[PDB]
């Protein structure tokens, strides 16, 4: 078989896992509540076919005298079917089983990298459990795999045999990344990103089990990327008004493009550094203009990975990360409606700002995913109350210079 090198993020995950082998933070857990009946055998066959379709679930990461590598394997896996029909609290026992799963650490050399289970906690209420490792999957690919399984199960139970996948093999990404490693374009992106972050500083940050506090709201006064740039400028202006930093840097995850016409599950996002300078008298329109300017003069070197940049330098480049994305559309599991609920995301990038919207809807959802060693349940809640009203004063007057705004408690 042919092996492939590990990406910088994958190598960091591997070494951080081997240093703390009792750490379950690199487990992404998810469960799907299906309000209806489920055929476990057809479900297992759909899991079959999608596992072989999204071949990132077939990767095995191994050690050798030549270094960390990865290849396509035939991983040995199971699908347990637990029936919690006869318990006083079936949901509690189901949550206990799932929590007992994703709380254990996962050895990466030889071991189950994903966990698929089926929980029946009511006569017509199933729960499909999904666990992965951060070295092989993110959240978006997990949702893609969830819908592919939903569609193929829907097909197989009604006699239909499903259409071909709209997925790309992970080998595409592996080979093009191997060729990008020896690329002149990679050396140019390196030179650019280290000229750009040369006389940089620390990151402006509100830093002092993973914390979360959600807040729903509605703004009156676009598309989606204007929403992204407005939220980026607002978070940067809030950081500057709270910390007094003219130079603040935010983390912006971008979906790298290199010629893949299909979504490759497991191919993650490169979070780029966006340094905004907040000169005096500046307003929101000026800050959004500078943000667009700086991302435009950086989206051509987007392929250069963040971890390689942070290693070619001298503990992080940014403390706050802005992730603007709508909610995922729901799935149908053989005619039955199913809604996903995530138990465990990934580790903390100090602070992750999540903005979730609905098409045609004015209501937003703000998420604060913070590191507990840097925030408190009270400090994070005060920042989200402070940041949101600041953002609302910004949305009502782009004419307003950031300095003349004074926010509360």
Residue numbers in the entry: 7 to 214, 222 to 234, 240 to 332, 337 to 431
Paste lines from the article.
Nonribosomal peptide synthetases (NRPSs) are multimodular enzymes that catalyze the biosynthesis of diverse peptides with a wide variety of activities. The incorporation of an acyl into peptidyl backbone is usually implemented by a starter condensation (Cs) domain, normally located at the beginning of the initial NRPS module, via the formation of an amide bond to the α-amino group of the first amino acid residue, a process also known as lipoinitiation. Genome mining of two Cs domain-embedded cryptic NRPS biosynthetic gene clusters, rzmA and holA, in the bacterium P. rhizoxinica HKI 454 resulted in the discovery of two distinct types of lipopeptides, cyclic rhizomide A (1) containing an uncommon acetyl chain (C2) and linear holrhizin A (2) harboring a medium octanoyl (C8) chain. Similar to other C domain structures reported previously, RzmA-Cs adopts a “V-shaped” configuration and consists of two subdomains (N- and C-lobes) each representing the chloramphenicol acetyltransferase (CAT) fold.
We found that compared with wild-type (WT) RzmA, mutations at R148 indeed altered the production profile of rhizomide in vivo. A similar trend, but in the reverse direction could be seen for the HolA A149 mutations, in which longer residue side chains led to shorter acyl chains. These synchronized changes showed that the length of the side-chain of this key amino acid (R148 in RzmA-Cs, A149 in HolA-Cs) might control the length of acyl chains. The side-chain may act as an entry gate to a potential pocket. Therefore, truncating the side-chain of this residue could give a correspondingly deeper space for the extension of longer acyl-CoAs. After our initial attempts to cocrystallize WT RzmA-Cs with acyl-CoAs of various lengths failed, we noticed that the R148A mutant protein showed strong binding to C8-CoA, as evidenced by the high ΔTm in protein thermal shift assays and a Kd value of ~300 nM measured using isothermal titration calorimetry (ITC). Thus we selected this mutant for crystallization, and successfully obtained both unbound and C8-CoA-bound structures. The unbound R148A structure is mostly identical to that of WT RzmA-Cs in two conformations.
